[model samples]
Target: GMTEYKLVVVGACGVGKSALTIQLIQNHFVDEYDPTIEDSYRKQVVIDGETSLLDILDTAGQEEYSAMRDQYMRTGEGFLLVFAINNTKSFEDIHHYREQIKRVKDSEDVPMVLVGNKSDLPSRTVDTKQAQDLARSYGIPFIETSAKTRQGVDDAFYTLVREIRKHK
Candidate 1:
């Protein structure tokens, strides 16, 4: 049987949310810094020998789009909470996304994954241990990825899909 899932990629601006989505779904790396409003991608993925259709929503990270977040949160079956390893401020903002998801979904057990992007780059401001500890406390999987190198990008998305499937 085939399953369908609605997943949202969210985080602070410049955390590589769109880069991760575009790399995973479109198989390309975008270095430009053009911000996103709300872009959706539809793709079929196979995880652990199971086929599923994914309706992925790549959301804007700017505060101006805060009003549109509730709609995205309400529709998402799973979330990829992304932050750049080089940006500590982005790391600190991760909880806001999680809290908003819980508030909008009206559930504390929403399927989510903590993603630390830009693993290929040096000068990381957010320590691996710090992010891992937070994910452990939240009881969600933590993934470090590099869109430029295409390392762990699929694993991150596939892991989130698996979590979503489990919660279903």
Candidate 2:
């Protein structure tokens, strides 16, 4: 077995994939960009003082990548699926992501974190209760975070990691 594992972050465009990576790696806010990135990668840290060298794959939100994104899911050990709380439409798309996860993973065996991002936004559209219910239905963890205010972001990652370790 490998000493380290790969974790992926997948979400629709503008759902804070880059911001989440910057927050986790740099521990700071990433400046807003005009067009979100199509893909990016970063190394990951484990508690044993070892690095996972994660492929962190920040996937595009565009529909053109649906097949490609599903392929990436095949190689991932864990996933961070994010959606913006201010955009209820994105929240609804979380279902598609969930189905994609199951299609690629074949089991709820691989750990996943359902992240409701942009918690700093005042006008919330997605209902917290609904998000929690869906997460429970899928048998995974859920969190609401804001990359802008740095709220609940780190906890989201750490908690998911902890859950994965428990499975081991």
Candidate 3:
């Protein structure tokens, strides 16, 4: 049996959380939306010449399933705190999500990634530099992605996996 990683993709609504996760598993794009979503995916992947399984839980914007977060966040080995490049509000709340994870995990630092999703579209608000600065402040990696165009999708998830590896 291979090592199994538990991951979570969190962000505000319409930030394309499912797209990034699905593209990572399917190597394609997902162009749709769901309200109050709670989806989980599992896949086996190879990184650094070793095979392992990654289990992911993709939640709705704001992670509205508040009741379930204690179980979900505590067990998660890593997370991708995603925000749309076009929306400042989405970007604003990443801090909230990140903070919550730290609290639940009882660690000041956790293996997490800051992701700017939907990069194929115009950057109406948050820029790459801003995201870099924000991620820098958190001492975490920042990655930009466009699940629709198939750009950086793999990097986003795989990077989180690597983070977990280094962290553990």
Candidate 4:
């Protein structure tokens, strides 16, 4: 059987969640692939010279998804915990999502990437040092990404896939 990475993207609203996911799947940027809706995408790409499949679940952060989130959380092999550098509350709520994943998966050593999206902006209410410290504490990779500029877009997802291999 081929390897597939079941990845879930989680963050507060207006954090560029869809932009990051679409950038990876379509190789281009867009305003928003309808943030009002939840979507799932599958793509086959070569990572580290091996064929791999990616199941990227793009979820909405604006409204309620109590049981809906848990359904995917149970199946999520990896996670991209996205937050905008310009939003403090979004960053503050990261731990909530982190805890939900661990609780649903029943494991602490879960594959995850802490992503600070909207790096193209010239402002940062959430400092890089702060994010780094949190990531260090959680023992996960911290990456700054700009869906518009497409910086570190691949590394963020690739790191999660790598972590899955390491965690396994």
Best by TM-score: 4
Q: Using alpha carbons, what is the TM-score of model 4?
A: 0.94
Q: Candidate 1, which segments miss by more than 4 Å at Cα?
A: 61-69
State in Å the error of residue 14, model 2: 1.3
Best by lDDT: 4
Local distance difference test scores for all models: 0.88, 0.77, 0.87, 0.90
Q: Which residues of candidate 3, in runs, are more than 4 Å off?
A: 61-68
lDDT, candidate 3, at 138: 88
- Comparison by TM-score, 2 against 4, better one: 4
- Across 1-168, the per-residue lDDT of candidate 2 in tens digits comes to 335545677777788888887787777888874444655556556655654545466665456536675686688777888999988888888878767777887875778889999998889988999999989988889999988888988788766666667764
Candidate 3 lDDT over 33-102, as tens digits, reads 5756678899999988878999988876453436476856689899999999999999999999898888
Estimate TM-scores for all models: 0.92, 0.82, 0.93, 0.94
Candidate 2 regions exceeding 4 Å error are 34-36, 44-55, 65-69
> Quick one: ranking by lDDT, best first?
4, 1, 3, 2
Better of 2 and 4 by lDDT: 4
lDDT of 3 at 154: 79
Clashes of each: 0, 1, 0, 0
lDDT of 4 at 168: 62
- The sequence of per-residue lDDT tens digits that candidate 1 reaches over residues 1-168 is 468888899898998988888998989998984684578898998778878888888887456536575765788999999999999999999999899899888889999999999999978999999999999999999999998888989988898988887784
**Per-residue lDDT over 32-131 for candidate 4, one digit per residue giving the tens place of the 0 to 100 score:** 4666787889999899898999999898746554787577578999999999999999999999989988988899999999999999998889999999
Ten contiguous residues with the weakest lDDT in model 2: 33-42
